[PDB]
């Protein structure tokens, strides 16, 4: 969930 959220932003 924290690279998702790497990835996303
Ligand atoms: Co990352």
Known sequence: ???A???AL
Request: hydrophobic share 65%; glycine share 0%.
């Open 1 to 3: 969930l924290a690279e």
């Open 5 to 7: 959220l790497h990835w």
